Amino acid sequence: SALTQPPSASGSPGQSVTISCTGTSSDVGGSDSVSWYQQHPGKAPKLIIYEVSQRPSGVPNRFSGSKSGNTASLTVSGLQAEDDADYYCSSYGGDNNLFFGGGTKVTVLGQPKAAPSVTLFPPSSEELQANKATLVCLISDFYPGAVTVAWKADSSPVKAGVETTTPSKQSNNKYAASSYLSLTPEQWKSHRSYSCQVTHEGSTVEKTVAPTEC
Amino acid sequence: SALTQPPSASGSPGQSVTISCTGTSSDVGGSDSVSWYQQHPGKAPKLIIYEVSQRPSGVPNRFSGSKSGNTASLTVSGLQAEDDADYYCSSYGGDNNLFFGGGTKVTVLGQPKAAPSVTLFPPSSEELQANKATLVCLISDFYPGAVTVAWKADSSPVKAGVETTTPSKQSNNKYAASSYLSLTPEQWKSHRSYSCQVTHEGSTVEKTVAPTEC
Numbered sequence: 316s317a318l319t320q321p322p323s324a325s326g327s328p329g330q331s332v333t334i335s336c337t338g339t340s341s342d343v344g345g346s347d348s349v350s351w352y353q354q355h356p357g358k359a360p361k362l363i364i365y366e367v368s369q370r371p372s373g374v375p376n377r378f379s380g381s382k383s384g385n386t387a388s389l390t391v392s393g394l395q396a397e398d399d400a401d402y403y404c405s406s407y408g409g410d411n412n413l414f415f416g417g418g419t420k421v422t423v424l425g426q427p428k429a430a431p432s433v434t435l436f437p438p439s440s441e442e443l444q445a446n447k448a449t450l451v452c453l454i455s456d457f458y459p460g461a462v463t464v465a466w467k468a469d470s471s472p473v474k475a476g477v478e479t480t481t482p483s484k485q486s487n488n489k490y491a492a493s494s495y496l497s498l499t500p501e502q503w504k505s506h507r508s509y510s511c512q513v514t515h516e517g518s519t520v521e522k523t524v525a526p527t528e529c
Numbered sequence: 530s531a532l533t534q535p536p537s538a539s540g541s542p543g544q545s546v547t548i549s550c551t552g553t554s555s556d557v558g559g560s561d562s563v564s565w566y567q568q569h570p571g572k573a574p575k576l577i578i579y580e581v582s583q584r585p586s587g588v589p590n591r592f593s594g595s596k597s598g599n600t601a602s603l604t605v606s607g608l609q610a611e612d613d614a615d616y617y618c619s620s621y622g623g624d625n626n627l628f629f630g631g632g633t634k635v636t637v638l639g640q641p642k643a644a645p646s647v648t649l650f651p652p653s654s655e656e657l658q659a660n661k662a663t664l665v666c667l668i669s670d671f672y673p674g675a676v677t678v679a680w681k682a683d684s685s686p687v688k689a690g691v692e693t694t695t696p697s698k699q700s701n702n703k704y705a706a707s708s709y710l711s712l713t714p715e716q717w718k719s720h721r722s723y724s725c726q727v728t729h730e731g732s733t734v735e736k737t738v739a740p741t742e743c
């Protein structure tokens with residue numbers, strides 16, 4: 316997205332959370348046209364802030380919006396269970412275009428936080444002899460169930476061939492997901508290493524694997 | 530107040546489908562500020578139409594929007610699997626109001642069945658060093674999105690320590706899931722092999738991995 320939002324935020328009932336929406340001087344910074352939207356997954360979204368700070372009728376004053384330079388911010392005070400949702404920002408542009416942020420998943424903690432176990436697997440013997448070199452990054456035992464994954468070929472980001480599953484709650488009531496990177500045998504063998512970067516609750520873990528002689 | 534959309538619509542591959550969005554004279558019928566969004570479950574939405582009929586760059590011209598009186602309509606020609614999603618309409622009204630429809634689930638009927646690709650990964654060296662031996666059975670590219678998984682230690686059923694993620698649709702419009710088996714290094718080294726057996730629509734794919742010899 317052209318506007319940048321943090322992937323996730325969280326707080327316990329009664330706490331406050333602030334989420335940011337960063338653009339450039341030609342969008343967020345160029346006018347007072349920032350809006351915020353709330354969506355409970357699967358249901359219609361709702362406009363909750365317009366013109367940076369204005370609440371539509373029925374939106375409680377626990378929601379407030381502000382802007383400083385090229386960054387707008389939404390604050391939710393006294394978190395309530397109904398505030399657990401996805402939040403998006405938008406801003407008009409210079410060419411009367413419209414820019415959206417990528418969305419922030421806001422969790423009202425329903426259980427203790429849990430950092431993910433991250434395990435990165437290199438290509439298996441069987442798939443290599445089948446001319447495939449898929450890497451798997453296993454992410455388990457985390458809460459809230461929101462994670463963002465990035466891959467790097469050596470030091471360069473790689474977006475092609477990346478797939479990540481939607482987190483699902485497992486039998487221990489914590490979430491699991493897997494990110495897999497479909498490489499050719501040539502790609503795998505011709506790089507010094509590949510890395511899986513897992514971000515959860517604003518904290519990042521990195522794992523790396525490299526080809527071996529056996 | 531919400532705008533009125535049918536809860537569901539459908540069509541076959543290559544066919545067309547039209548879905549409607551009915552508002553009032555002071556929103557949909559009041560100006561040319563009608564928008565349409567496409568959203569796959571668990572993902573951020575994508576604006577596909579603005580100002581009744583305009584497509585953002587990169588949106589296929591198979592999507593077309595029109596408006597008559599109080600009712601806007603989206604038409605998707607040449608339906609593709611990727612078009613199976615929720616579709617929302619929106620319209621600005623007076624008083625800086627932004628109205629949203631309740632959403633239409635568009636189903637693309639009779640999508641092709643696809644058996645899963647299964648790749649079984651043995652424990653990585655890093656985790657065997659940290660006294661862990663998780664195995665991951667990666668299951669991808671299958672449709673419809675339901676599988677069952679069974680594990681074997683040698684030829685015997687594994688009855689504990691298994692987790693399987695809820696399948697999720699990926700960028701190829703087919704489903705992916707992971708099943709992971711938590712073992713200790715001692716369990717991994719004692720047995721001759723471990724096997725993952727994936728059942729999809731009555732057919733079973735089995736993979737086997739054994740302690741390496743490197």
Ligand SMILES: C[C@@H]1c2ccc(OC[C@H](C)c3ccccc3)cc2C(=O)N1CCOC(=O)NCc1cccc(-c2c[nH]cn2)c1
Nearest residue numbers: 352360403412413414415416566573574575576579585617
């Ligand atoms: C990922 C991001 C995104 C996030 C949120 C979201 O809706 C949130 C709403 C509340 C919503 C709707 C439906 C369900 C839930 C939430 C849409 C998008 C989008 O599409 N995204 C991808 C980046 O592309 C853009 O920013 N394009 C915006 C665009 C492009 C070109 C022209 C115009 C234009 C001109 N003039 C008026 N409009 C606009």
